[PDB]
Write a protein that binds this ligand. Structure first.
Ligand SMILES: Nc1ncnc2c1ncn2[C@@H]1O[C@H](COP(=O)(O)OP(=O)(O)OP(=O)(O)O)[C@@H](O)[C@H]1O
Ligand SMILES: Nc1ncnc2c1ncn2[C@@H]1O[C@H](COP(=O)(O)OP(=O)(O)OP(=O)(O)O)[C@@H](O)[C@H]1O
Ligand SMILES: Nc1ncnc2c1ncn2[C@@H]1O[C@H](COP(=O)(O)OP(=O)(O)O)[C@@H](O)[C@H]1O
Ligand SMILES: [Mg+2]
Ligand SMILES: [Mg+2]
Ligand SMILES: [Mg+2]
Ligand SMILES: [Mg+2]
Lengths: 239, 87, 248, 209, 33, 395, 401, 304
């Protein structure tokens, strides 16, 4: 009886509506992000769109600024709003402070907006979790995850959405300094992270690759094919 | 009609059921009656009995008003604690 | 239950009011659109075909928004009118600010943002209207856009909204040839689909509206087919069906 | 309009056993007693056949079956299901006929209006300028009446009144004639009774209209 | 429950009306003859 | 004492396939059965004292012997017994009756004419309870369950290991779990696990449904529950399987109906037998339900139900194990790759996996084949599953 | 387009295939089943035990002598005496008769209202009988002290104190109350969440009551026949009154103490009303302290919960951290644990958990340490048990820090 | 009397004086459960079902094949199917198919339909189910037909005042008798319903309802077959084209097809003739297939 209002505390001090908003994130396609020394990658599974529909409008990885990008989970309707407000915020921050927006700052503002939307009745929580990464630290790669609650955290590597637990365990098992020593190895690591929960062929794995002082580079199907071929070569070498 | 005892009725009932017990002259039965809204006669008798037992627990030879208030609390199974936001 | 208001999240994390609004869309009349190489069209079914009802607007289901956009409508009539009025307002506002026609997707995104805001803030019910969009723009050309009551849109080549949507969409996916459809073939396919999408037989012209979008000399003329050409398409489909059963 | 009266006429004119129940009789407490009574009625009709079952005011237990979410709500659906099974189920009745009377006929379950269960759906409309004349003549035939009263004056009036309203008009006319210590019914008391019975609006609070 | 009362008052009670026995109900389209 | 009345079962035959070794094992079992029949048939026939005493006791008892209830014991040779009609009689106790077990409330045996106590009805079990006892153990063993390794381990550590190896629990100082509930989606393996437990157990097994525990009369429900648990106590190592506990385990609430309150009373008697005044004894209770959230908290609280064993829908490995088990008897083809059916979306249960095999065999019979193929399996899958979901909202 | 199976198809399907050993195996299986049935039918006795004494114990041919000489006597209570005096006897449900005593007994022995034995032919009174004692009610006594004590209850110091103050101290030391003129409560309602230890406290009370402890079986109070439950309650209270300072325990009082409504329970409500007027009303109850426990006190009749029938209402709330630590120590005293187990940490890891859940945690820790072949349960096993018992039945915890 | 035939719960006869067991007698059956067994088979035959041939063949793979030739299932290594559910729009032939099965079967057919299992007292429904399955096992092989299974087989509602818990207890007893601790041998169940989504997931699960046979509304050829079946005894005129009548009945049910024949005959009865013309069939098509629409364009125009 304590889960029908956002501003009502349960006897054990639980805001159950916020947790129910969290539950919507787990119903979205997985997004995997891992940062390297000179690379930040955003793995995303595709839902194998209908044969008679265009994928161009089902974009899940979007860039807030010229050098910060985010991948979300949960409902697309809330995610689009969050991304639009984040873009407006980074542009406004550039206007007031000529320095480019920081990935930490944009993460903090996204978390603040989510928190403001889970602070009163008559405002449904944003049921999306965002994986914000970027080289905005001017020489330092950063990765961030915003829970729909309004809390953000810095992760060396993290996963959100359906099957996030398995990918998180995988990454905890093999995210090492040696694994991310080069960009190609980091991209391969993203590929192995996404393969286990997304079993399928090509076009089901979308990777966003951003290099230092560069722009977002959504890998074409040919590139993910060559990387998955490389992974198959590695596993056949292992056997 | 047998109604729920009012303030005067509750005070009189507590006086009746405390007649056999050694009670301080300082007990304000009018204050007790105010503190026991929606109490029937049986609950007032239980208030007196529990006040007597609370006095006996402390080894007090005579009852006190605070003993009666604690008995009022114990009749409805309520427990009073020092709340951290009530100062 | 967890459907008292739209802001309530189910323990599984589902907006029950939003899902209710979408499931309610099937009550609306059948609307569909086919994207062809030379243009895009919309097809609608008139549920109300009473002889005492006069047809004065001829556009009860298909609305013109901009000089290069049009939209079909399926859902609550009042919400439909509100959304189309807002669509015209956004279109003219963008035209005033930028002095160029809207790139289709921007206007659809504006409506979807408004609808999402309605399903997010308390005290407002979600807009129980799902509407298809057609238009041409300088960036990607002809596009067919779908809108849901939740504000989730998506690019599509051919869809159907309203009564018996699933069957129409399935047969669309079955017999649509990507990149090999002309406007005439698209019209024939739309008529074929609308024939058995609705239970009414013979596909009366008075019960069906079709509007087509074309790119002629950089003008983007929006044409609503009159009863004559609709009846010609009906007779063409009838003769095609007669030819098909000749093999039997 | 004369539904129950026609069922009464059928009961009087038939050589088969007649069973008369009300749809409200089936709605009981003690779950499983409603369908038990439905089954009891149908089995009773089966034992002494041919038989006729008249379930008047069945509109109570006839509403379109929806997803009932309470036990009491499921009880009426269970009653309707038992009635459907008894009418057209595994045990074909044979030689028993079921007559039902409602006032809506559109809120009823489509399974009940199935051509295997309720073959004929006969409409009993409000009497028109013809049926009203026949009703007036039939009712007033036994009444003493008078030479000066002309029932055609009252029949031609545009007021839409059922046969029960006609009977009430005639009974009030008799009461008015008897109140004035008169054994004859004339135009004046008949007219006053007509005006009294016609007044059916009561309050209506003046703004619904 | 109301319909049951409607049927009870419209039963054969007025059919026989044995030996002029009336009903004197006391309390607080039911008002027609 | 009255030790456990374990269900009887024959030794299992391993080969399964209709080979010669299976025939030899079955012939050996038949040979032992024939030897037993011959021995216990030639016993009484070859056989050619106590007869005088038995005859004297039988003539003194007479026939028929009425069954009454002992009310009071007045002297060593006099007592008040109430006949089944409710009338008490001051009768005499005959010498050939144990005065030790003659206790008030017991069912005494009375002479038809004099009504003197001539014996005591020892069992006197309610016939509605003695049916619950399992006599023929089910043939489903633990080898008939695919996956469910954790569930099998918990159920064993609760009901089987304490009997087989009590030393671990004795040395550890812990009393083994005496109550388990098996909950999960329908067709997952709850009743299968209970059947396997009954097949493997050496203790007496009592199976109820939770709907036969409800009786028409007022006090007969709780009385039946008490009689069932008394019978479980009589045979010291006992397992009571209450399937479909939702039937009576539903949450208590203020109900304005005699039936609902009586059912709540039955459940209260059940959970007073489970954990109340007096120790329950060496009686372990297994409960099964498809809806544990609707159960009364007092019923499934620790102390009554110690292990809440979850039974989730099978995953890929469990689905493969169930397919291997349920296609073992089938004459499978070569092109049949079960992995295509094992994949599924998320909702293939163990019960569905067996219906898939049955339907595939039926489709093979349709084509006059006794060897099922891949097309048969896919047709069976798309024929046998009945579904019921969110729309395209989440990305 | 599927085709039905024909007789030739059936014959081929049952023949064309494996048939060298299938027929033999099937026949052997069937005849093994038949032999099993035949063995069962041949033995099929399971001789039912009857109360037959050892042959040396009876060895009596005089049993026939007493069978023939002694006559059975119907029991009946002499309701009214008549003054040759006549006697009106009530033969339970059979009938009422006006009889006279046989020559064996004297008129002085027979008094009004006592139950006597009468012959089945003339109904003459032949022998007076002791007053009826109910067998079910007399078995409602405990007479066997449970082996749990107050030291086995942890985290209920004040609850145990109040319970003793009602049911123990007035019986043991009535002087501490009569001097101050204090009338002790005669009833307790132990209410709280299930598993908090109210039944355990009742058992501890019965373990040291040193008086008559009566545990009331709720099933017996609910009888099939009308008016029998109220009668049973009446005899139960009478039996309690015969004894000195009786103790009566009603566990799960909500079984019969449900709120009245308007046939429903009726008979159960009548039994509850009988218990209500026995506890308080005319005819003072006497030295009978009643004990009642229930985990759903809200469903009880307000008349039964009235503080003249259930005077003291003790709440068994969830234990605090000190209480949870005490319960952990109590339930791990016999456990083979290590010396470094921080039971305070385990108590803090079970925020809202009853003592039953603590015992379940200890049992699961022992089970975990048994699973791996270890004879000592480490703190890791207790942590795993706490997880499995409390936590089993991360993104949500991500918000808290 | 051999003691070995005196099994528990049998009704023995005892002499007037010594109560001597002298006859074994038929077993006791609850009188309400005794009338559930079909004694006079229904007259509906398989040839009276038109348009449902696949449905008949699928139902005979569970009702007929497992009991007539059980050796095939042991040889295949599969388990015999036990239950079939017939679901579809009203008047499609579910009860007609159940009546035809009860006519052509050699097994004991037991009918228990509607609320025969819904009793006032507590536990009576469960006891009736238990004794029904005991009776079915005694007369094995047997077929239980549960028509209108929505009455007791609806989805389990949570407890409370708004709860059908007693009917749910009866349903749970039925569930255990269908797939529980004790397996049922040579007992098949047929269930019919118009709402398959109302039924509980535990009742529809495989093992209890192995095959779900759907009865869609007859197509044009199926409608023609039903028309020819229900007009076989009718004196059709020479200019009767029953195919056109089938085309004039789109989306009709089997009961409506029969009602059309009945009304076409009733028109001839009205005109006092024993033959029917095409016009009679066409007017009956209109009289039977008369639907009710919204009648208020206001409500119709809420949705564009
Ligand atoms: N894990 C499994 N491995 C093998 N067979 C299984 C498994 N789970 C289920 N089955 C099969 O499914 C059949 C039906 O399942 P079962 O009797 O165990 O149901 P349940 O879990 O008790 O559910 P419900 O009581 O709702 O029917 C079993 O007889 C068995 O053959
Ligand atoms: N305070 C406690 N101290 C020690 N052990 C406890 C405590 N409370 C409960 N327990 C343990 O929990 C077990 C079950 O508790 P108990 O039988 O007393 O439950 P209850 O409170 O009477 O609940 P219910 O409502 O189910 O009757 C006891 O046998 C005991 O081992
Ligand atoms: N496929 C069919 N072929 C022939 N007659 C049919 C068919 N379907 C229905 N009917 C006729 O219509 C009636 C349908 O009633 P019934 O089958 O009992 O309804 P339900 O299927 O809803 O139980 C039957 O009397 C039957 O004679
Ligand atoms: Mg009427
Ligand atoms: Mg089961
Ligand atoms: Mg207890
Ligand atoms: Mg039917």
């Amino acid at each position: 009886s304590y889960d029908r209002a956002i501003t009502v505390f349960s006897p054990d001090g639980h805001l159950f509506q916020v947790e129910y908003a969290q539950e919507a994130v787990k119903k979205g396609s997985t997004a995997v992000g891992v940062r390297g020394r000179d690379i930040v990658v955003l793995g995303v599974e595709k839902k194998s769109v209908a044969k008679l529909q265009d994928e161009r409008t089902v974009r899940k990885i979007c860039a807030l600024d010229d050098n910060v990008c985010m991948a979300f989970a949960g409902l697309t309707a809330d995610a689009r709003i969050v991304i639009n407000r984040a873009r407006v915020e980074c542009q406004s921050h550039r206007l007031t402070v000529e320095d480019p927006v920081t990935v930490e700052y944009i993460t903090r503002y996204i978390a603040s907006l989510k928190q403001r939307y889970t602070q009163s009745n008559g405002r449904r929580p944003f049921g999306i979790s965002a994986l914000i990464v970027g080289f905005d630290f001017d020489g330092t790669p950063r990765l961030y995850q915003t829970d729909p609650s309004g809390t953000y955290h810095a992760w060396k590597a993290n996963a959100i959405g359906r099957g996030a637990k398995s990918v998180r365990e995988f990454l905890e098992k093999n995210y090492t300094d040696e694994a991310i020593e080069t960009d190609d190895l980091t991209i391969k690591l993203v590929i192995k992270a996404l393969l286990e929960v997304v079993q399928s062929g090509g076009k089901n794995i979308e990777l966003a690759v951003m290099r230092r002082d560069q722009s977002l580079k959504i890998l074409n199907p040919e590139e993910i094919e060559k990387y998955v071929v490389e992974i198959e070569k590695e596993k056949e070498e292992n056997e | 009609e047998f109604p729920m005892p009012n303030e005067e009725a509750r005070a009189r009932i507590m006086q009746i059921h405390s007649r056999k017990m050694n009670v301080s002259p300082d007990v304000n039965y009018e204050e007790l009656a105010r503190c026991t809204d929606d109490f029937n006669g049986a609950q007032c008798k239980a208030v007196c009995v529990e006040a007597g037992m609370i006095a006996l627990r402390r080894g007090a030879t005579e009852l006190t008003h605070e003993d009666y208030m604690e008995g009022i609390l114990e009749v409805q199974a309520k427990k009073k604690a020092n709340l951290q936001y009530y100062a | 239950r967890y459907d008292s208001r739209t802001t309530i999240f189910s323990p599984e994390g589902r907006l029950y009011q939003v899902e209710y609004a979408m499931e309610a869309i099937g009550h609306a009349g059948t609307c569909l659109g086919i994207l062809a190489n030379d243009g895009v069209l919309l097809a609608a079914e008139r549920r109300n075909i009473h002889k005492l009802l006069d047809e004065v607007f001829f556009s009860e289901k298909i609305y013109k928004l901009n000089e290069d956009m049009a939209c079909s409508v399926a859902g609550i009539t009042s919400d439909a009118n509100v959304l189309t009025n807002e669509l015209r307002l956004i279109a003219q506002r963008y035209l005033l600010q930028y002095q160029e026609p809207i790139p289709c997707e921007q206007l659809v995104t504006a409506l979807c943002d408004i609808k999402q805001a309605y399903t997010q803030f308390g005290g407002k019910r979600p807009f129980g209207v799902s509407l298809l969009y057609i238009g041409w723009d300088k960036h990607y050309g002809f596009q067919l856009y779908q809108s849901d009551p939740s504000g989730n849109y998506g690019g599509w080549k051919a869809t159907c909204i309203g009564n018996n949507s699933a069957a129409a969409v399935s047969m669309l996916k079955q017999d649509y040839k990507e990149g090999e459809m002309t406007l005439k073939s698209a019209l024939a396919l739309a008529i074929k689909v609308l024939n058995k999408t609705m239970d009414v037989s013979k596909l009366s012209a008075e019960k069906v509206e079709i509007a087509t979008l074309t790119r002629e000399n950089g003008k983007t003329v929006i044409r609503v087919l009159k009863q004559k050409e609709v009846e010609q398409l009906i007779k063409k489909h009838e003769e095609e069906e007669a030819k098909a059963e000749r093999e039997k | 309009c004369g539904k129950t009266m026609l069922a009464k006429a059928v009961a009087h004119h038939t050589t088969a056993a007649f069973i008369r129940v009300v749809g409200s009789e089936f709605v009981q407490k003690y779950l499983g007693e409603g369908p038990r009574m439905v089954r009891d009625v149908f089995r009773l009709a089966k034992e002494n056949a041919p038989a006729i079952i008249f379930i008047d005011e069945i509109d109570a237990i006839a509403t379109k079956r929806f997803d009932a979410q309470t036990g009491a709500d499921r009880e009426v659906q269970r009653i309707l299901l038992e009635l459907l099974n008894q009418m057209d189920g595994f045990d074909q009745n044979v030689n028993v006929k079921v007559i039902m009377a409602t006032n809506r006929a559109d809120t009823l379950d489509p399974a009940l209006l199935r051509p295997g269960r309720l073959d004929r759906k006969i409409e009993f409309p409000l009497p028109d300028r013809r049926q009203k004349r026949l009703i007036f003549s039939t009712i007033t035939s036994k009444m003493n009446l008078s030479e000066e009263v002309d029932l055609e004056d009252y029949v031609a009036r545009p007021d839409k009144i059922s046969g029960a309203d006609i009977n009430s008009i005639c009974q009030e006319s008799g009461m008015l004639a008897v109140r004035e210590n008169r054994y004859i019914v004339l135009a004046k008391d008949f007219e006053k009774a007509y005006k009294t019975v016609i007044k059916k609006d009561e309050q209506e609070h003046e703004f619904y209209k | 429950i109301q319909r049951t009362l409607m049927e009870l008052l419209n039963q054969m009670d007025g059919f026989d009306t044995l030996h002029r026995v009336k009903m004197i109900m006391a309390t607080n389209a039911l008002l027609r003859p | 004492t009255k030790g456990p009345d374990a269900a009887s079962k024959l030794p299992l035959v391993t080969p399964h396939t209709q080979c010669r070794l299976k025939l030899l094992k079955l012939e050996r079992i038949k040979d032992y059965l024939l030897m037993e029949e011959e021995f216990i048939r030639n016993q009484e026939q070859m056989k050619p004292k106590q007869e005088e005493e038995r005859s004297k006791v039988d003539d003194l008892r007479g026939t028929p012997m009425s069954v009454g209830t002992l009310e009071e014991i007045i002297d060593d040779n006099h007592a008040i017994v109430s006949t089944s009609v409710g009338s008490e009689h001051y009768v005499s106790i005959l010498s050939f009756v144990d005065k030790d077990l003659l206790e008030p409330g017991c069912s005494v045996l009375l002479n038809h004419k004099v009504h003197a106590v001539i014996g005591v009805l020892m069992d006197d079990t309610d016939p509605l309870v003695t049916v619950m006892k399992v006599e023929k153990a089910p043939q489903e063993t633990y080898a008939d369950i695919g996956g469910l390794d954790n569930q099998i381990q918990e159920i064993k550590e609760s009901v089987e290991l304490p009997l087989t190896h009590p030393e671990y629990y004795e040395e550890m100082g812990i009393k083994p779990p005496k109550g388990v509930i098996l909950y999960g989606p329908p067709g997952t393996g709850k009743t299968l696990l209970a059947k396997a437990v009954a097949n493997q157990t050496s203790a007496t097994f009592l199976r109820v449904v939770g709907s036969e525990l409800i009786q028409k009369y007022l006090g007969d429900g709780p009385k039946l529950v008490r009689e069932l648990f008394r019978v479980a106590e009589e045979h010291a190592p006992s397992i009571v399987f209450i399937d479909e506990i939702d039937a009576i385990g539903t949450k208590r609430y203020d109900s304005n109906s005699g039936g609902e309150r009586e059912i709540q009373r039955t459940m209260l008697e059940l959970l007073n037998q489970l954990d109340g005044f007096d120790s329950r004894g060496d009686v372990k209770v297994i409960m099964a339900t498809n809806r544990i959230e609707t159960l009364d908290p007092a019923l499934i609280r620790p102390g009554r139900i110690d292990r809440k064993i979850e039974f989730p829908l099978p995953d890929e490995k469990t689905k493969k194990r169930i397919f291997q088990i349920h296609t073992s008897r089938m004459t499978l083809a070569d092109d049949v790759t079960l992995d295509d059916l094992i994949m599924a979306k998320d909702d293939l249960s163990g019960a569905d996996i067996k219906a898939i095999c049955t339907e595939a065999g039926l489709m093979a019979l349709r084509e006059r084949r006794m060897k099922v193929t891949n097309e048969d399996f896919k047709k069976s899958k798309e024929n046998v599953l009945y579904k019921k979901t969110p729309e395209g909202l989440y990305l | 387009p599927i085709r039905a199976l024909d007789e030739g198809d059936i014959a081929l399907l049952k023949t064309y295939g494996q048939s060298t050993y299938s027929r033999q195996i099937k026949q052997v299986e069937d005849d093994i089943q038949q032999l099993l049935k035949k063995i069962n039918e041949l033995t099929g006795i399971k001789e039912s035990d009857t109360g037959l004494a050892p042959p040396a114990l009876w060895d009596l041919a005089a049993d026939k002598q007493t069978l023939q000489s002694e006559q059975p006597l119907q029991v009946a209570r002499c309701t009214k005496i008549i003054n040759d005096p006549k006697y009106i006897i009530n033969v339970k449900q059979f009938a009422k008769f006006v009889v006279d005593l046989s020559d064996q007994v004297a008129p002085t022995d027979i008094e009004e209202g006592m139950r006597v034995g009468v012959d089945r032919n003339k109904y003459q009174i032949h022998i007076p009988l002791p007053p009826k004692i109910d067998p079910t009610v007399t078995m409602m006594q405990v007479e066997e002290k449970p082996d749990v004590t107050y030291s086995d209850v942890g985290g209920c110091k004040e609850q145990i104190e109040k319970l003793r103050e009602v049911v123990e101290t007035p019986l043991l030391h009535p002087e501490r109350f009569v001097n101050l003129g204090i009338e002790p409560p005669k009833g307790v309602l132990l209410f709280g969440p299930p598993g908090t230890g109210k039944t355990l406290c009742a058992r501890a009370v019965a373990n040291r009551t040193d008086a008559c402890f009566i545990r009331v079986i709720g099933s017996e109070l609910v009888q099939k026949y009308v008016g029998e439950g109220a009668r049973m309650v009446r005899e139960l209270f009478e039996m309690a009154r015969t004894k000195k300072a009786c103790l009566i325990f009603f566990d799960e009082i909500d079984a019969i103490g449900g709120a009245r409504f308007d046939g429903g329970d009726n008979e159960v409500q009548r039994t509850m009303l009988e218990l209500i007027n026995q506890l308080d009303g005319f005819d003072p109850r006497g030295n009978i302290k009643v004990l009642m426990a229930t985990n759903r006190p809200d469903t009880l009749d307000p008349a039964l919960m009235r503080p003249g029938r259930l005077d003291r209402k003790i709440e068994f709330s969830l234990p605090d951290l000190e209480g949870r630590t005490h319960i952990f120590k109590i339930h791990a005293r016999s456990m083979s644990v290590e010396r470094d187990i921080r039971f305070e940490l385990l108590a803090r890891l079970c925020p809202n958990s009853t003592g039953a859940e603590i015992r379940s945690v200890c049992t699961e820790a022992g089970m975990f340490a048994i699973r791996a072949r270890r004879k000592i349960a480490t703190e890791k096993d207790f942590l795993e048990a706490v997880n499995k018992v409390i936590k089993s039945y991360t993104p949500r915890y991500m918000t808290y820090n | 009397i051999d003691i070995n035939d005196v099994t528990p719960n049998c009704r023995v006869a005892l002499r007037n004086d010594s109560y001597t067991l002298h006859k074994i007698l038929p077993n006791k059956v609850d009188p309400l459960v005794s009338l559930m067994m079909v004694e006079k088979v229904p007259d509906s035959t398989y040839e009276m079902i038109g348009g449902l041939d696949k449905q008949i063949k699928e139902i005979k793979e569970v009702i007929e094949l497992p009991v007539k030739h059980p050796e095939l299932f042991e040889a295949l290594g599969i388990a015999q199917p036990k239950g079939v559910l017939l679901y579809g729009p009203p008047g499609t032939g579910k009860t007609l198919l159940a009546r035809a099965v009860a006519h052509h079967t050699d097994c004991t057919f037991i009918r228990v339909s509607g609320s025969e299992l819904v009793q006032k007292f507590i536990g009576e429904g469960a006891r009736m189910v238990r004794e029904l399955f005991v009776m079915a096992r005694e007369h094995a092989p047997s077929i239980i037909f549960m028509d209108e299974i929505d009455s007791i087989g609806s989805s389990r509602l949570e407890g409370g005042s708004g709860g059908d818990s007693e009917v749910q207890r009866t349903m749970l007893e039925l569930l255990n008798q269908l797939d529980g601790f004790e397996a049922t041998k040579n007992i098949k169940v047929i269930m019919a319903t118009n709402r398959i989504d109302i039924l509980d997931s535990a009742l529809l699960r495989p093992g209890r309802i192995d095959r779900k046979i759907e009865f869609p509304p007859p197509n044009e050829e199926a409608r023609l077959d039903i028309l020819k079946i229900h007009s076989r005894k009718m004196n059709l005129t020479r200019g009767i084209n029953l195919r056109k009548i089938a085309e004039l009945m789109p989306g009709a049910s089997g009961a409506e097809v029969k009602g059309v024949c009945t009304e076409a005959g009733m028109y001839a009865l009205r005109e006092r003739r024993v033959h029917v013309t095409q016009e009679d069939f066409e007017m009956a098509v209109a009289k039977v297939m008369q639907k009710d629409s919204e009648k208020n364009m206001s409500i119709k125009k809420l949705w564009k």
